Amino acid sequence: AAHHHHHHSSGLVPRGSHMANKAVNDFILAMNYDKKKLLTHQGESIENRFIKEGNQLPDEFVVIERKKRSLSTNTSDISVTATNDSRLYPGALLVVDETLLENNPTLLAVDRAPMTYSIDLPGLASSDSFLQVEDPSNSSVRGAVNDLLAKWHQDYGQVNNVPMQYEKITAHSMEQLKVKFGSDFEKTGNSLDIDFNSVHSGEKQIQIVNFKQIYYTVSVDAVKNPGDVFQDTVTVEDLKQRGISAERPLVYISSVAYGRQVYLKLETTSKSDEVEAAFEALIKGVKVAPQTEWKQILDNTEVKAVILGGDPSSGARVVTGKVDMVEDLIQEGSRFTADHPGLPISYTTSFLRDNVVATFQNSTDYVETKVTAYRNGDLLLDHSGAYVAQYYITWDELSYDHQGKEVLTPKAWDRNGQDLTAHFTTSIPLKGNVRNLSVKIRECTGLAWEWWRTVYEKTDLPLVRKRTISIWGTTLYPQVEDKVENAA
């Protein structure tokens, strides 16, 4: 007796019956899977073997120290890069597999039961926040939301000045960026034209800034029973036909954030350690003095950006140029108006089975490259004395061997020890290479009991941009000037 109740004598479960929805509900509840393992991905996992490198650039000598780092993110927020993604609407059903991890999700588009949404809008009434969509799709949900928006803007609603939020990192690897911003980021990074090669060779430094402006978010309350999102026309076999199982379970978009997003690239050829500070000052719109080190950095900074939402169409703009246009990028989407509903920039998913928020674990190993720059310099000599003079100029040229060991190669001015006469001038180019610079200058007095007189003798001379050593005067009273020009 107990076997037959709530069942058809045919033994079949009729399509469009309450029995069908019940079977679907039990079918999803019966699923046993590991939530974390299904949403976990590993990046590269590099090994810690690195040697110190030295390289000569046209204007400077760089010392590069490579190091393996680890970046691991564990978030439920999924960044949106697609423009008009029909799949990414509130309450949409997504399949849990590789495609969900890659942010190119598989939409489960079956007959949907009505769903109730709430929207958090600054200056929106309590019970006017709810929306009842009878047949959830991208269109029906988008329409219901925009209808509420249009009403909310035309009725009243202050032009809410939207807060700007941003997170930033120093670029190193494309994989590392993907862990930080999402695995769909590769499209954006290619638009930003990030020069990873020049970073690794220490020729330039990159910082990536992600701006977010959330106008509003649409949310879905917890689903009581897994089968409550399906119409009775949906059967268990229908789900299996589309490959739904405990191994490929279901998830629903529990909320979507709407507004404007900006991925910013700050590309500087500087090797300074004040780069992060200079970039920050730029973002804050802080005035920069011309003779500062920051101004040197910012003048040599190329800026590219991808705009998602705000201003014109929904389409993504790829603006390019100098530092001057960063300020307007930030101010552009400051106000949320009737002109633009705003578009999805972020969404979150919850498992259909138990409404637990789906959290994605991503990690990767990357090489953190440090670069230390030593500027080239020139050593200038001027001989305007009434005497024969000799120079003894000597230095070491620094290099690094294939084992990263430090190497000092002795060097000497080819005209050392030679008798030089006024008016003699010369310029000796010295690379950042140079350590332990020593200059000795002596003069022939003509006196039999003391033929030579030292006019100048310094060791460990700093490699400034321009050092001019000028000698003049007489055999008995020689004069010397050690003039340094190293101002920025």
Author numbering: -17 to 470
Describing publication, verbatim:
We also deleted Ala146 and Arg147 (PLYΔ146/147) in the loop that would clash with the last β-strand of the central β-sheet. X-ray data were collected to 2.45 and 2.5 Å resolution from crystals of PLYD168A and PLYΔ146/147. Superposition of both structures on PLYWT showed no significant overall differences, although a detailed comparison indicated small changes in domain D2, helix bundle HB2 and in two of the D4 loops. In PLYΔ146/147, one loop connecting D1 to D3 is also slightly different (red arrows). (A) Ala146 and Arg147 in the loop that induces refolding of the last β-strand in the central D3 β-sheet into helix α13a in the late prepore and pore complex. Deletion of both residues renders the toxin inactive. Even though the structures of PLYD168A and PLYΔ146/147 were very similar to PLYWT, they displayed major differences in their membrane-binding and oligomerization behaviour. PLYΔ146/147 was not able to bind to the membranes at all and had no detectable hemolytic activity. The pivotal role of the loop that contains residues 145–147 connecting helix α5 of D1 to β7 of β-hairpin one is underlined by mutant PLYΔ146/147 that was completely inactive and did not even bind to liposomes.
Gram-positive bacteria, including the common wound-infecting Staphylococcus aureus, the virulent food-borne pathogen Listeria monocytogenes, and Streptococcus pneumoniae that causes pneumonia, utilize cholesterol-dependent cytolysins (CDCs) to attack and kill mammalian and human cells. The bacteria produce and release CDCs as water-soluble monomers that attach to cholesterol-containing cell membranes, where they assemble into large, 200–500 Å cytolytic pores. Sequence comparison suggests that all CDCs have the same domain structure and therefore insert into target membranes in essentially the same way.
